Amino acid sequence: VNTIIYNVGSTTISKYATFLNDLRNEAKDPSLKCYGIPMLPNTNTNPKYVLVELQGSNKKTITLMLRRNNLYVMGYSDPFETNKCRYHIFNDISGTERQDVETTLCPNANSRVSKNINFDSRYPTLESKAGVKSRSQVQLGIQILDSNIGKISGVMSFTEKTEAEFLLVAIQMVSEAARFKYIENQVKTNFNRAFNPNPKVLNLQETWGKISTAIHDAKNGVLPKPLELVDASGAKWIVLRVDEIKPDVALLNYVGGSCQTT
Numbered sequence: 001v002n003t004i005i006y007n008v009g010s011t012t013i014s015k016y017a018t019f020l021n022d023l024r025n026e027a028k029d030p031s032l033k034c035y036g037i038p039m040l041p042n043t044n045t046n047p048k049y050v051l052v053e054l055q056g057s058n059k060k061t062i063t064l065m066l067r068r069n070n071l072y073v074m075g076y077s078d079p080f081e082t083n084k085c086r087y088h089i090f091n092d093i094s095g096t097e098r099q100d101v102e103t104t105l106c107p108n109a110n111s112r113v114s115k116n117i118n119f120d121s122r123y124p125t126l127e128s129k130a131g132v133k134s135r136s137q138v139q140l141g142i143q144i145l146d147s148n149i150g151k152i153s154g155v156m157s158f159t160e161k162t163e164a165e166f167l168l169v170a171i172q173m174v175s176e177a178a179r180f181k182y183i184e185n186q187v188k189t190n191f192n193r194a195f196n197p198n199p200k201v202l203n204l205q206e207t208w209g210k211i212s213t214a215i216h217d218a219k220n221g222v223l224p225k226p227l228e229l230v231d232a233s234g235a236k237w238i239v240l241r242v243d244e245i246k247p248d249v250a251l252l253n254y255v256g257g258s259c260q261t262t
């Protein structure tokens with residue numbers, strides 16, 4: 001398991017681009033790719049994970065554990081108390097993967113402490129815990145991410161709301177950005193300020209699975225069937241070809257079988 005380190009407390013759009021670039025290259029399958037878009041690996045491929053160390057301001061850090069197969073954030077850890085490593089597993093992680101999260105994040109069996117995330121990683125759950133109707137109401141931003149890291153890293157207790165806000169921002173600025181070039185660019189355009197994710201970033205997030213399947217199954221650049229997405233204004237957007245959606249996509253979800261690689 002390789003860990004990607006990203007300094008949030010002090011960065012540039014150039015550093016953010018490099019970070020996502022390293023993550024994409026670490027997560028992706030060495031050869032799997034459809035229409036020039038790299039695809040995530042089969043669940044049998046090792047390693048199965050990749051860590052993302054987020055270095056915030058005032059020496060506050062949080063490490064994210066991501067499954068390479070689908071780029072989901074399975075949990076995170078933070079330096080705690082003296083020399084402890086506190087791991088937080090998502091409620092929706094089951095079986096052996098739960099031990100993988102604990103032992104992967106905090107390799108030292110002697111100093112690790114547990115503080116489970118008592119809810120799943122689905123957006124509607126996170127939104128509900130955050131106390132909002134939609135994550136569009138939750139502003140993203142580098143200083144916001146930095147600020148949320150400081151509210152959790154090394155802090156004994158913290159509200160489910162506080163935790164959900166961090167997860168919302170971190171998942172979008174880390175996992176969603178790595179998957180979509182469009183989302184990465186949205187962060188870069190508003191790099192020095194806070195912003196509300198638009199109808200297109202949120203729709204892209206919610207349709208990644210469908211998009212990945214449509215591109216994998218596309219014949220000579222033609223989607224199996226018309227794909228109904230939505231643009232930044234909030235208008236319906238019917239994509240008919242790979243060429244129409246590719247510009248916004250950096251990584252494809254793992255989709256079984258062969259596809260046109262280039």
Ligand SMILES: Nc1ncnc2[nH]cnc12
Nearest residue numbers: 071072073121122171175
């Ligand atoms: N925890 C998570 N990480 C990445 N993508 C997600 N989509 C829904 N939950 C997610």
